[PDB]
Amino acid sequence: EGMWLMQQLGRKYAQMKERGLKMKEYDLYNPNGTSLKDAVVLFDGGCTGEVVSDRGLVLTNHHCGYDMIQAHSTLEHNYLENGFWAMREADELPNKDISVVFIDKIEDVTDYVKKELKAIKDPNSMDYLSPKYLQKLADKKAGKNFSAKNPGLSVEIKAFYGGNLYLMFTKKTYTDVRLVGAPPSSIGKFGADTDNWIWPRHTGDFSIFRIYADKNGNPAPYSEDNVPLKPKRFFNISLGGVQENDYAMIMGFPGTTHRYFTASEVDEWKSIDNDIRIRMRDIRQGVMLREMLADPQIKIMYSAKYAASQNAYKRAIGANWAIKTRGLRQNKQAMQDRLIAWGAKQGTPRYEEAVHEIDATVAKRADLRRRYWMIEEGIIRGIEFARSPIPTEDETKALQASARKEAIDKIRTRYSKFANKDYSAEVDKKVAVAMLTEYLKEIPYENLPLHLRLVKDRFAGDVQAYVDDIFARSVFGSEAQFDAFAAVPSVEKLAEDPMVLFASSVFDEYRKLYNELRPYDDPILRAQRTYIAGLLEMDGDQDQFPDANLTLRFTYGQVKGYSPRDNVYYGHQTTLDGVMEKEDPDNWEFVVDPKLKAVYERKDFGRYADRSGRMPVAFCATTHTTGGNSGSPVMNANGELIGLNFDRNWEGVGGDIQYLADYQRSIIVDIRYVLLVIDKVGGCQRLLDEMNIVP
Amino acid sequence: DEGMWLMQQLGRKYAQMKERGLKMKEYDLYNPNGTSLKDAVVLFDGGCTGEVVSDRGLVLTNHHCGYDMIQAHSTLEHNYLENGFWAMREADELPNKDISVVFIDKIEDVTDYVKKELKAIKDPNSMDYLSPKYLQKLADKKAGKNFSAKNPGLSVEIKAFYGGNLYLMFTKKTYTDVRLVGAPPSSIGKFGADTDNWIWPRHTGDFSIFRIYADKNGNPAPYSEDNVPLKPKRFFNISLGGVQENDYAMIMGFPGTTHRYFTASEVDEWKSIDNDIRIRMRDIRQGVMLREMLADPQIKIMYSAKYAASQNAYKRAIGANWAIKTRGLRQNKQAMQDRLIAWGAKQGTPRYEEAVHEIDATVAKRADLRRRYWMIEEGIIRGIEFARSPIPTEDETKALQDASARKEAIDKIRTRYSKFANKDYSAEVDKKVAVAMLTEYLKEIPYENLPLHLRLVKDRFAGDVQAYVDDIFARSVFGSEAQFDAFAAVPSVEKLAEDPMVLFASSVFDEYRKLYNELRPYDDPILRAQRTYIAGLLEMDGDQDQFPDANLTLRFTYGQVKGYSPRDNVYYGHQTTLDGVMEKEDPDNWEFVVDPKLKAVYERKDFGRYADRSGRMPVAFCATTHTTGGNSGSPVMNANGELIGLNFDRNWEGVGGDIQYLADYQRSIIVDIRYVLLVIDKVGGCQRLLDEMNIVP
């Protein structure tokens, strides 16, 4: 059910031990010693990773290492499609702008922060949540020259439970993290977009890196003189596998949750955020799909844009399914009613007053928030020519010195970025006509961005004519129209350009809405501090976890499948046989690697197959995870590595507001499948040899 | 494998059935010399199966079986198709024109009689042994002079089984006054609609209720207001005990066709020609139709039924090809024929191997012709609507070329033109479909094999299919209403003889018939070799574990209530519930709308004695019985012979079951009788139907 603070391990230990945990408490998390927590890293600022050897070998997801694999790929050595397997440490590829963060120490600094906050004076100050203010307190507690006296170490204070608890983290950051291994994309991203958020899952979502450091194991930027880090702790790999009901636990960095949403915030999330994103993306994707299906060249140009739009579209459908079917609104309503009844009995009205302030703030901002989501989904991300070039103040104050050519060169660079090899003006006009037709039906004339008033005023409500006129008369409507402008440029031409005016007025409205909506965040945040304080005072902090905030957490549960719908059961484990069932040679998403297909046919599974001779691929668990948990180590009752978390099923996206015991599952790549791929596909025996594999 | 057994085979199967759970006495299920459960089974409306469930001739069958009757009685004032129908008294039950119910009164093995008559052979290659005309002459000879007049209501029929190695004579009793009694709303009767066709899990209450009427003595009689409900020889008791995983279940019914004795070469032909062509051509046709329906709401209305009709056999072919690819169907037929060949070689009889060789050689010989036939049938005959545009008859052309019968010829041509270009026909949609279909057809069929008019694509239009199709509509008398009316005002035979649409329609139908004529001779050598092939299989492995192919005759099948795993890590259980209907509810999708009375029954848990032990309301179950088309509406029985459900479908994974039964995938999809009784009771409120049934606790 929860995403627990490391401090909460003491209070959860007896429940974990009854559920199957076998390791000693301090072997998992020791606040003043070495523990398993010391083998967990925040990988590249978003993902989780884990150290799996005494030479700093790190495992994370393939989608986590995707950018590094792509940056080292060329036409001659396409690592993204073929996989990468460094046969010696010297062949491991350095990565620019990478980092791994270890959580060296964690301390409760609540009383210290609350004492410092007493000097504020202004009761409505937001300093209690300010990263700048909390950094000043972190620095004061750690000392003037902390990072100079403790190289590689840094401090950070974060707020938890809406400002009712504060923790100081002592972090050790390494920036020389080299690419060691990766399966082909056919394995690393087998399901590709079709199987995103899907269980059963057959994706070998892993990649391998290595942390390098100076001669003393201290952090150091990339240098050819750097040596592999010898860490104080690494995970042992288990080859014992998993069974239904086995205890499983994860450590990682879940990003965000909204477990303390009021019922009014759940209604707002459904009726505004989700319904608008669903409606607008369905229109956009429908036009894009029609055009991609009709022209093979349009499919090539728009495939990535279509897939990117689909990600949050699918998430919103999953979230709305939970709101409709799992009683999310009703459960938040019962939580707040129970606090209100308890507050009335204790004679303290501040809790009911805080819930009232959140409801009133939500109700007040409804029209503005609807307008913001409509323009953001409908135009800002919906229409490509909304991001067409807008001449800067220095560019207009250059066209009207011979630096007219410099301004034109900068405008041309932005025009070529907008109208690139993947941009179709015809596809964009079709998308804009459908998107604007919906936007104009939903937003009244008086709330429209200034240029969109021309649809009714100048074009007699003809959206197609308004869009045609933008491209026909704009200097960014075609290459020939831009070149005619670039030969005889004038500020008068740019100031009256229909595309520039559209882009300017839609971005003006988008910013004006953002500015009007920003003040509504603070009364909700302040009321949440009081709301969560009451929930904690009423029921305690030993069943009510703090919202995720990109900090180290543990979660535990069992390896267990679930029933998605009447008469259908999805088991706890997928197999290599399931990859072969999904093979479609003429569908790029479901192509199967020839070496992997050969391994399956010859049953060359070695020590990685289960007791029945079947090769495991992935498993699912009742652990509570979210975005940020990608690459998290999944542990046995003994703390041994049994897999890597890589996804969550769509039925569990609602889990960020309310954990769903009968539907929500973490989707995990089995460590036996990771080793089978390293061994039989990569042939990288040295990686297997440096790991500590337990029978 | 697990089969469709002849009623005669019950004796030799009984011990296996009893070990599997059967509790009833053999002769209570089927007795050739007296009343048995077989007497409560009917062939409903010439295709479906039905069952008698009361001493007043009440009959249950599927909703899709009674669909046409429910539709024929529906008006804007009383829409029975949409709202359901529930006659509150026998006098309110609606008669149906052109309906029938057939009872299988007697079944007799007449193999020796037919084989003796066949010895009067004037030609060894004679196909009389399979001729319905010849076999009817033998049935009439055995039954007697004027049997029909001496026994009003009874008729006799002889059918061939096992490719002509076994013959049975059926004495049938036919009733034609069968009245509509009850039907749930279409939202229950066809809940999944086309989306859930061939799908398990299934949540459809696929049932309808009729009543057999007869004269005062229970003898068949056409509709008359003086007709009285039939008191039957036997009826099914209804069980409210339900089903559990692994329970014994059995069915009786009329499976239509199977191909259990296909050679491996016939399996390859079915996959590589029949299925691959139907899949490829229908995917092209459906793709164009879908794009046009999605772009225009009026095109969606006009083409929805045509699109759904094309999808039925398309989905079946995909399901059939999945079994051929994954279940080793070709290999299993190959092993069957190799085993017979080895046994034939040891017996000193080469005729079995010679028969398999004749089938393979015939299949190989007809390959190019069969490919051309399926290409034109799927690609043009079915694929392009203007292929069925009007073609002036010989007498119509004669009438146009010095009498007042010219207006008569134009009125008949106009009637056919208005039927082709009806309210659901779009010439623009048809031109788009034709351009895609012809492009594929022209790529597959070389110039020398093309229908005559299609040679104009290369010869006159420089390979431009779009221009050839545009020219057909621009210049044809049937290209638009205005073009037809201009023809009808000044009609000439010269205009019709050069019409590009008439020439297209004529030449594609000419090629279709020429191909059919050249392919027909190949059927008989295969049929004759199959008689020898199946005779050998029967002599080798016995008439014990291999059943005769389905041929629309009464058969029984048995198995267990059991789910299955469709793919890695996925399990479908044996039973669906009312909770599954509620999960699928979509008010703005006509296929998944939920009846308000049914939704209220679910919310109030007003399930009475119909819910299972855990308080859940069952809807449907699946079983390992071996069924096919023709088994719609079949009674599903308990170990005690009590009615536990009605068969209504089969999962797509089991369509390969017509060639080879698939124990781990194939399942009969059955509506639970508890859900039928719940709908009659809580949705229809038709208590008199419950009261006339014999319900066992």
Ligand SMILES: Cc1nc[nH]c1CN1CCc2ccccc2C1
């Ligand atoms: C609940 C629902 N409504 C329309 N479609 C569906 C099923 N969706 C639900 C949302 C989703 C997201 C990612 C991947 C698959 C799916 C399946």
Ligand SMILES: Cc1nc[nH]c1CN1CCc2ccccc2C1
């Ligand atoms: C095996 C297969 N090949 C393409 N699609 C599929 C999946 N199934 C699943 C859906 C379905 C329903 C009825 C008939 C056939 C099928 C096809």
Ligand SMILES: [Cl-]
């Ligand atoms: Cl370390």
Ligand SMILES: [Cl-]
């Ligand atoms: Cl012989």
Ligand SMILES: [Cl-]
């Ligand atoms: Cl099987």
